[PDB]
Structure 1
Amino acid sequence: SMSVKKPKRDDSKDLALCSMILTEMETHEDAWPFLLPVNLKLVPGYKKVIKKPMDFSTIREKLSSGQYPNLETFALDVRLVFDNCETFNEDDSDIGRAGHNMRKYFEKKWTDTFK
């Protein structure tokens, strides 16, 4: 509360470390469904059904331009990519499996870097 603060967690490396995690996600062999925005002209249903589209390239641009106020807002966009994937794709599809694999990969890197 006013003039009463918990001890200052060092956040000065967070930008660098989110960039490294994002690099690792970009270079994973199962990243291909997620590298670019879904083409809303060419994929029936996507525009209407997925209210907040997100992809790695869009997270990368946001990251590079100071659009994440903190590391939690970065984790929310990454998770959004996988939550959108599960909303639109059957679990038993190459893309559905890709999304599950990538979410697991991400959550381990997140825990090991920050928790």
Structure 2
Amino acid sequence: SMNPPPPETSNPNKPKRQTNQLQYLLRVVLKTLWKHQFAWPFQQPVDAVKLNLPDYYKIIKTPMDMGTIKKRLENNYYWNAQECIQDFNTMFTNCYIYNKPGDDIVLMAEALEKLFLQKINELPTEE
């Protein structure tokens, strides 16, 4: 049971912007989560072949990971901050959907999400 192609990270015909909020999402939100001791399972698409999880992409239809988010931010892929915030939230929700409560991977996601929520609470107002 195979891996799908990764999420899109470049699209020239997609309208996009650089805003102070999106800069914050990269320089603060992404960075802070990326350096966390629990970040590594989330830093790239799940290789569900290597992990022997043949059902993974049969259940998780909208996968998202921080490697993809990082690329999108570095590529100025997004139109607004909420588009990027949705990607983070999809990543967390997918984790809680696929896994059992209390699993180590869920604890890792919860630690990242707690930080994510704190940084989003301090999202600067649009300039």
TM-score of the pair, normalised by structure 1: 0.83
Which structure 1 residue ranges, 4+ long, deviate > 6 Å from structure 2?
Answer: none
1:53 is displaced (CA, Å) by: 0.7
| Equivalent residue number for residue 14 of structure 2 | none
AA aligned opposite 2:120? W
In structure 2, distance between residues paired with 1:15 and 1:96: 27
In structure 1, distance between residues paired with 2:124 and 2:54: 39
- Relative contact order (C-alpha < 8 Å, sep 6+): which is higher? 2
In structure 2, distance between residues paired with 1:113 and 1:94: 29
| Equivalent residue number for residue 67 of structure 1 | 77
Between the two proteins, what is the percent identity of the paired residues? Answer: 30
When Rg is computed on C-alpha atoms for both structures, the one with the higher figure is 1
Q: 1:29 aligns with which of 28, 32, 37?
A: 37
Aligned-residue CA RMSD (Å):
1.6
Matched residues, number: 105
TM-score of the pair, normalised by structure 2: 0.76
List runs of 5+ in structure 2 lacking aligned partners: 1-17
Q: 2:24 aligns with which of 4, 13, 17?
A: 17
Per residue, is there more helix in 1 or in 2? Answer: 1
In structure 2, distance between residues paired with 1:18 and 1:99: 18
